Amino acid sequence: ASMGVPALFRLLSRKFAKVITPVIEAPTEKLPDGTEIEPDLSLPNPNGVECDNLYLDMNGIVHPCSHPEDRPAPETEDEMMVAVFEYTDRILAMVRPRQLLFIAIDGVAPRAKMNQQRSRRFRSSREAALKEEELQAFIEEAKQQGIPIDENATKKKSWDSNCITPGTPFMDTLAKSLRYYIINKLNSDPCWRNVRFILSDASVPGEGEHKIMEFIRSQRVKPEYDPNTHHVVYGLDADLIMLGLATHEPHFRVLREDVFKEERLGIKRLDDKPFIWLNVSILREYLEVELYVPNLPFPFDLERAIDDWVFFIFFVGNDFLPHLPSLDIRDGAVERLTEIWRASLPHMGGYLTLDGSVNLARAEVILSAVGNQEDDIFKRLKQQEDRRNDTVRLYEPGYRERYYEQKFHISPDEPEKIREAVKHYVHGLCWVLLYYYQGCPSWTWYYPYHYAPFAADFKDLASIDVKFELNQPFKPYEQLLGVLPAASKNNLPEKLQTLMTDENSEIIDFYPENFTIDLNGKKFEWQGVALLPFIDENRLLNAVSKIYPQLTEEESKRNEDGSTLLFISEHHPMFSELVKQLYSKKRQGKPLKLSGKMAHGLFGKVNTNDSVIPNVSVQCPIDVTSADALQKYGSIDDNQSISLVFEVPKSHFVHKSMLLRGVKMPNRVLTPEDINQVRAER
Amino acid sequence: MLREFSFYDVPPAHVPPVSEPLEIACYSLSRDRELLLDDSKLSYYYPPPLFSDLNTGFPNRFHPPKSDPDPISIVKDVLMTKGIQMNSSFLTWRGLITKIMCAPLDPRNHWETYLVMDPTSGIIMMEERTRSETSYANQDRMCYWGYKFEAISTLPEIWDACSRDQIEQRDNQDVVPDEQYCSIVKINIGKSKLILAGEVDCIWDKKPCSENPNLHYVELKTSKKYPLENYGMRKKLLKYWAQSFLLGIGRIIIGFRDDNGILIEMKELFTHQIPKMLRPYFKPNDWTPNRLLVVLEHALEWIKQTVKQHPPSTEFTLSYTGGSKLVLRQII
Numbered sequence A: 001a002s003m004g005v006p007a008l009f010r011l012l013s014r015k016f017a018k019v020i021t022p023v024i025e026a027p028t029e030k031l032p033d034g035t036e037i038e039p040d041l042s043l044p045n046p047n048g049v050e051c052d053n054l055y056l057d058m059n060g061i062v063h064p065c066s067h068p069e070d071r072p073a074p075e076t077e078d079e080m081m082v083a084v085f086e087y088t089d090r091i092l093a094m095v096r097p098r099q100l101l102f103i104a105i106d107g108v109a110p111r112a113k114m115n116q117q118r119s120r121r122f123r124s125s126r127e128a129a130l131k132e133e134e135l136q137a138f139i140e141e142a143k144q145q146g147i148p149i150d151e152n153a154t155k156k157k158s159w160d161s162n163c164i165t166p167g168t169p170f171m172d173t174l175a176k177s178l179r180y181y182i183i184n185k186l187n188s189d190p191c192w193r194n195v196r197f198i199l200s201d202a203s204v205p206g207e208g209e210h211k212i213m214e215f216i217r218s219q220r221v222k223p224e225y226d227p228n229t230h231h232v233v234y235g236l237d238a239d240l241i242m243l244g245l246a247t248h249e250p251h252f253r254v255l256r257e258d259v260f261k262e263e264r265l266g267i268k269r270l271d272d273k274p275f276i277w278l279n280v281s282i283l284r285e286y287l288e289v290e291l292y293v294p295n296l297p298f299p300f301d302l303e304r305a306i307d308d309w310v311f312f313i314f315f316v317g318n319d320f321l322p323h324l325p326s327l328d329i330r331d332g333a334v335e336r337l338t339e340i341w342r343a344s345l346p347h348m349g350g351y352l353t354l355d356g357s358v359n360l361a362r363a364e365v366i367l368s369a370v371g372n373q374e375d376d377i378f379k380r381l382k383q384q385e386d387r388r389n390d391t392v393r394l395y396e397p398g399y400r401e402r403y404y405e406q407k408f409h410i411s412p413d414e415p416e417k418i419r420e421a422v423k424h425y426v427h428g429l430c431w432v433l434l435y436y437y438q439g440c441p442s443w444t445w446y447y448p449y450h451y452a453p454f455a456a457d458f459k460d461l462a463s464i465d466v467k468f469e470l471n472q473p474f475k476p477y478e479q480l481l482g483v484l485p486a487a488s489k490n491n492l493p494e495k496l497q498t499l500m501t502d503e504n505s506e507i508i509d510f511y512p513e514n515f516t517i518d519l520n521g522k523k524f525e526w527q528g529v530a531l532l533p534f535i536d537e538n539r540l541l542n543a544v545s546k547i548y549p550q551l552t553e554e555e556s557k558r559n560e561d562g563s564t565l566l567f568i569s570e571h572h573p574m575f576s577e578l579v580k581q582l583y584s585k586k587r588q589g590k591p592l593k594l595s596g597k598m599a600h601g602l603f604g605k606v607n608t609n610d611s612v613i614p615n616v617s618v619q620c621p622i623d624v625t626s627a628d629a630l631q632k633y634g635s636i637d638d639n640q641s642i643s644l645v646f647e648v649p650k651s652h653f654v655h656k657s658m659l660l661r662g663v664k665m666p667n668r669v670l671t672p673e674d675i676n677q678v679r680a681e682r
Numbered sequence B: 001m002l003r004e005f006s007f008y009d010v011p012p013a014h015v016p017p018v019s020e021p022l023e024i025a026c027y028s029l030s031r032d033r034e035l036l037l038d039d040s041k042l043s044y045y046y047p048p049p050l051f052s053d054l055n056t057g058f059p060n061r062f063h064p065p066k067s068d069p070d071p072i073s074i075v076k077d078v079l080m081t082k083g084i085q086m087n088s089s090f091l092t093w094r095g096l097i098t099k100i101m102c103a104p105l106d107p108r109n110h111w112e113t114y115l116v117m118d119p120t121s122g123i124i125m126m127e128e129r130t131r132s133e134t135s136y137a138n139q140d141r142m143c144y145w146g147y148k149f150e151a152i153s154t155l156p157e158i159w160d161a162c163s164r165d166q167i168e169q170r171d172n173q174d175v176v177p178d179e180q181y182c183s184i185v186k187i188n189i190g191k192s193k194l195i196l197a198g199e200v201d202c203i204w205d206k207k208p209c210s211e212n213p214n215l216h217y218v219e220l221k222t223s224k225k226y227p228l229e230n231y232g233m234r235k236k237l238l239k240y241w242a243q244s245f246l247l248g249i250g251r252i253i254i255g256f257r258d259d260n261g262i263l264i265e266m267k268e269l270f271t272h273q274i275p276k277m278l279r280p281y282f283k284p285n286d287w288t289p290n291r292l293l294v295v296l297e298h299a300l301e302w303i304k305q306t307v308k309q310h311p312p313s314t315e316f317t318l319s320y321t322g323g324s325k326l327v328l329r330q331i332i
C-alpha cells in the first residue's frame, strides 16, 4: 500500500521545507476596453529557471479534469478534451519548455501495479455503491419530510474514471485529440517551433511515469546528450519525486497543484488553484547533510547514498509491497530507517544498493535492527494511543503467532510458510528497485499476500536466490479484466463482459461484489486492507483466448501495441537534414538513426508515419462549445509539421547511478539556518 | 649566415587570418614507445572525485615518459603510409610552434630547433634533436600531478560502456604518459600553411562518423589557482589557449590543486572563450592573443623566406636563449 500524497508532502513540509516552492505565472494585462494581453511565452520564465524538457503524466491531467472544483464535471468526451486542452495550455504557459514536450499516457502496467489498481478500483466501486444507497435513502426521507432537494445537482453525473485505462474507446479519443493538440501547438505560437513533441499513448505499454524515466535514461546514455538538461515532470503519483532522484539528473523538478452526513453525500437543496514546484536539486542538498557519514572505510558517494534512501523507504510501503507491521511514515519510520542506515554503514562493507541491485546481506543488517525494536515499537504505539482522552495484540507477548495465524493463516506448526512469505517480499524489494533503475524485470511478478512479515523474520537473506521471469505486458483487455470490478463491465468489449458478470463464467470467482476490508489498526475503511482474491493469470488468459476470435478487427487492433510518435515543425533546425536522410535512397523502409549534427540533442530511431495522408488540412477531432475555445482550438488548413514513429535507444549496459561529466550544479539554496536545523534533528 | 628576429621590431598589424585546424590523420602510441595507425589510445573525459590526491602512485606506479625528442620524420612517415599529400610550407610538432609563439612570454625558457627544407616536396620540417630544457623536469612530482590528473580523468570507452569498477578503480592504475592519442592537423596562419601533430588528452563525447573532430577534443591541465588579476595566471591561461588553439582543441579542463597536490576544483573552458575572458584584465604593453598571432605570422614568414634563399637539405638552427630575439643559423 502506498504512503500517499498528504504523507510524503507532510514529510517534505516538515523536514525538507525548501524543496517546495510556488509556481509563478505571468499575468494577463487587462486594458480598460476589455482588451486582454496574454503574456509572451517566448520571454524568460518568471520562475527564474528555464525548462528544456517538459514531461506530462497525461492521466494525472485527465483525472483532475474529470472532477473540477468550481466547474462541475464534464459529461462529454468533447467537453473532457476541451478541459484537458486548457489545463495543458496552463501548464505550458507556466513551464515554457524550450526543447521538448513529452506526453505520456499510461500503457499496460506490470502485474504488480495492476494488483494495486485492482484493489483501488474495487474499493472505489464499493465506496460509490455504499454512497449511492445512503444518498437514495436520504432523498426518500427528504421527499417525505417536505424538503426540496435539487436532485439534478445532488445526483451528480460522474465521469467513469475506469475508462481512463488502456483498451477503452476514450483512449482512442484522447490519443487522436492530443495528436491534433500537438499539431495545433506546432502551427500556432512561434515559441513552440523549436520544441519537439513526443506522444506516448495508451497503446504503448508501461506506466506514463516510467515511460518518462525510461526516456530520460535512454538519452543520458548518449555521449552527445546535454548534461545540463533542465527537466520538469508533471504527475500526481506519490512516487514521482523518488523517480526524480533515481534519475540522477540534478536539474529536475516536479510540477503539481498545491496540495496544502450532509457534507459527504453531496446533498444540495433547491432553496439554497495555485501550482507548486518540488525541486529535486534542493532535495539532494538536504540529503547530503542528512546522509553524510564521516570516517567511512570506503568513499562517501552522494549518488549511492540517495539510492539507498530511495530503497529503504520501500519498507514503509508502496504500490507493490505492504508496509512492514512496525513501520509507518507517520510514526517517523523514514527517520528511524535513516538512523539505522547511518549507524550500520561504517561496518556494513558498503552501500545497501548498487545500480538497482540490492545487497541482501546488508538489507538483513538494516532489517535486524528494525526487528529488535518492534516489540517496543508496538508497545510505545499503544501507550501513546491510549493518550487520546483487535485480536492480534501486537503490544502483547505471543503476537507473532496471532498475526501469522490471523492475517496469513499460518499456524505455528508451519514455519516454512513464513519463510516463503519473506522470500516473496525480498523478491518484491528487488523487483521495485530494478523497476525504478533498470526497467521492469517481470511483467507477471506480484507479491501474493495482503500483509508483510515482521522485520525480525528477515533473517538469512543472502541465501535467497532472486530471479525474475520477464515475460510480456498483458494485452489491454487482459489488464482491464485484471483491474476492473464487475460494476465497470462497460469498459470491455461486450463479449468479454460476461466473464465478470455471468454466474457460469470460468473466472467468476475473480469478481465478487462483496469482500472484506481488514482495518488492521482501527481507523476508517480507507485505512484498511481489501481482502481480494489474486487472479490466476493462466485461467484469465485461457478464458479470453476463447473469446478473442469473435472480436471485430477493430476490437482486435485496439488489443495490440501501437507506436510512440515524434512531431517536429518544418521550421525546426533539424528538419531539412532529417528529411534529406529519411527520404534518401539508402532505404526508405529501414529506420533512420538520429546521429551527428542532424540529431540536435535527440536520440533514437525514426521512421515514416504511414497513417498520415499528405493533406495539410487538419481539423479538431472533438466539438467545442465556447467562442474563445473554437478560436484557439480550430482547424489547421496548412500543417507545417511532420509526424514520425519514434523508438528510444536501448543500451546494452547497466545504467549507472552517477552524475554525467559536464554537469554544472544548480546554485546552492540551503543557508546556515537550514543546515543548522537538519543537524539537530538527526 | 646568422639572422635575428626581434619580437619588438614587429609593427602593429591586423590579426592574421587563421583557418579551422582540420584533422587529416591520427595515431596511437603505446607504453613500449611504438606507433599504431589507429584510434586504439583514444580516451573519453570523465572526472575524478574532488579532493583526489594527485601524489598517489608516485613513483611506484609511474611509467616515466620518453625524454629524447621525437624526430618529425615520424609524422612524415605516417602521412606517406596513408597516401596523404603534403602541400604546405611547414611540417612540425604543434608544441614547437607554441614555443616560437610564446617565446616573448617566457624569457627563462630556452630552446633550439632544427629546420630542413625537403628537396622533393619543398616543405620545411622542424624538430628538436637535443633533449629539451622542459623535458629535464619530465618525472618531477609536480609533473606527475598532471599525468595523474589525466589518468584519473579519462576512460577507455564512453561513460555508459564502462563498468563502475573501471571508473572507480582509476586511482589504482599505472600512470603511463607514453600511452597517447595524437592528431595531425592542417592549419593556415597568414600565408603559412602548417601541418602540425600533437597529443590529444581525451574527447568530450565521441569522434564524429567521418565533421572535423578537433572541437570535440579536450586538453587537461593542472595548476594552482590564482585570480585573473594575477599576471602569472593570465600568462598561463594565454599559453593554455595558444597550445590548444594550434590543434583546434575545443575545451580546456583545468584541475586546480593545492600546494600538496590535492585536487580542489575543476574548471571547464572553451578554448575560444579564453581571449574574451582575459580582455578586461589586459593593460597597455601586454601580450594579447592577437599580438602573439601577429608576431608568430611574421616569425614564420621570416623563417620561410630565409630558408628558401638556400638549397634544399640545408640544415638550419633556430634558437631562443632569452632576450627579445630569435636567432636563425645556417649550418655549414
Ligand SMILES: [Mg+2]
Residues within 6 Å of the ligand: B201, B219, B220, B221
Ligand atoms: Mg595535458
